[PDB]
Amino acid sequence: IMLEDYQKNFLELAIECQALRFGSFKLKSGRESPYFFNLGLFNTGKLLSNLATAYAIAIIQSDLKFDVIFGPAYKGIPLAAIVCVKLAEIGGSKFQNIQYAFNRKEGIIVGSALENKRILIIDDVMTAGTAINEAFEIISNAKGQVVGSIIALDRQEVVSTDDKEGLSATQTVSKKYGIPVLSIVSLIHIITYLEGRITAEEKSKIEQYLQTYGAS
Amino acid sequence: IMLEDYQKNFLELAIECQALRFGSFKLKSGRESPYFFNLGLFNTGKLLSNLATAYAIAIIQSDLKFDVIFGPAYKGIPLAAIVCVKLAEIGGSKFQNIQYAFNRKEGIIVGSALENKRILIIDDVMTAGTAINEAFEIISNAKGQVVGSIIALDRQEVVSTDDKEGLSATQTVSKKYGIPVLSIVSLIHIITYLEGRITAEEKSKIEQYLQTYGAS
Ligand SMILES: O=P(O)(O)CP(=O)(O)O[C@H]1O[C@H](COP(=O)(O)O)[C@@H](O)[C@H]1O
Ligand SMILES: O=P(O)(O)CP(=O)(O)O[C@H]1O[C@H](COP(=O)(O)O)[C@@H](O)[C@H]1O
Ligand SMILES: [Mg+2]
Ligand SMILES: [Mg+2]
């Protein structure tokens, strides 16, 4: 019910650079969505610095212990790099020696051997889990141990409206692999941010979207 | 004959993390080289932050005006990202809105359209110019204008010892494309750094390598 400042700052910038837009949008399924998100619109030096900061503070706050930050090619490659750097810049002693790595689409791993290292997978978004599945395969081949994942925005929507469990995409992954799926923000945070920027009618109607499709 | 502090700091870290090593090494040609360089050993969060800083200060000092920083896949992708961020962090107002882009090995450009933008190509190293050639092709297809390139270490060696011109690899490129090829350091800087860390005999013998193969 409160937003951390890093989450405020992220969301403010996402809306200003138009990475986050509000309106009527259809997903692949065909489901109405009241917003569109494209992390790729964090595309300047100022914006990428801000994004790095946001991911790094999310990570620091989670208290996850890891050795390597891994980005799935291609979009995870820059995110892994800029985040690794920011963690060493803002995280103190414990984050100086974190490594990054990523895969060539076709060894396959660019970086120090992953053997016996604890890996945090970073990416932009997750839906069906195909990039997470591929990273797990590549990482487990190199004898790494995945301890977590992080994405920018957790849509916090049920994968299906017939699933009784009502697992979201990040929940699905989290269950299957037994690891946390962190995010900078979720749908709930976007809603809290909008308090007093939108009308009561608009507030209602988004707080109703949360009801029909919100996970669990 | 003086080293900027950023160049000192770079070289100190390169030697400590073993990205730069001294000894006897053979190139592909077969030529003796008195060192080995592997930028990929800047592989921690602290080291990548330092590398970002080094490239960004080199760029700032050059006074080159550009709009986009472009990294050739794969190794240029993280370098472009971390450098773009650092430029916005340390460069002031003029560097806030710089964009980055890079190519998929197989559109091909990830980032905002390059049409009418001034591009700085960033990579780790250059020898025959194959990655520069490929970037020029991709960039000129997208109507971008390349205004420069930067690499980490300029080996400052003649490509061939039969060429009368005695052009180095970066010089060759610079001539063919009509653009500056910047670097964080060159062979001359490595030599200046070593003053008083190595013996007179070792100083002589490296200052002799400079004579037989040093460009121009
Ligand atoms: O990162 P690219 O080189 O652009 C390839 P792709 O578009 O597959 O990548 C996107 O989808 C992935 C999500 O997978 P899923 O939606 O099945 O969870 C995630 O990695 C995004 O970058
Ligand atoms: O960057 P990678 O995905 O590892 C591919 P590659 O090894 O071709 O890349 C290396 O060579 C390029 C130099 O080219 P030349 O030596 O002909 O000037 C430069 O881009 C390096 O990253
Ligand atoms: Mg991806
Ligand atoms: Mg390359």
UniProtKB/Swiss-Prot annotation, chains A, B:
Give the signal sequence positions.
Answer: none
Q: Give the residues the record marks as binding 5-phospho-alpha-D-ribose 1-diphosphate.
A: K28, Y74, K75, R104, K105, D123, D124, V125, M126, T127, A128, G129, T130, A131
Q: Which pathway, metabolic or otherwise, does it act in? A: Pyrimidine metabolism; UMP biosynthesis via de novo pathway; UMP from orotate: step 1/2
Q: Which InterPro entries match?
A: OPRT, Or_phspho_trans_dom, PRibTrfase_dom, PRTase-like
* SUPFAM superfamilies for the chain: PRTase-like
This protein's source sits in the domain of life called Eukaryota
Give the molecular function GO annotations: orotate phosphoribosyltransferase activity
Could you state one GO cellular component term attached to this entry? cytoplasm
Assigned keywords, A-Z: Glycosyltransferase, Phosphoprotein, Pyrimidine biosynthesis, Transferase
Give the GO biological process terms. Answer: 'de novo' pyrimidine nucleobase biosynthetic process; 'de novo' UMP biosynthetic process; pyrimidine nucleotide biosynthetic process; pyrimidine ribonucleoside biosynthetic process
EC number per UniProt? 2.4.2.10
Quaternary structure, per UniProt, is: Homodimer.
The identity of this protein, by name, is Orotate phosphoribosyltransferase 1
Organism (species): Saccharomyces cerevisiae (strain ATCC 204508 / S288c) (Baker's yeast)
Q: Which gene encodes it?
A: URA5
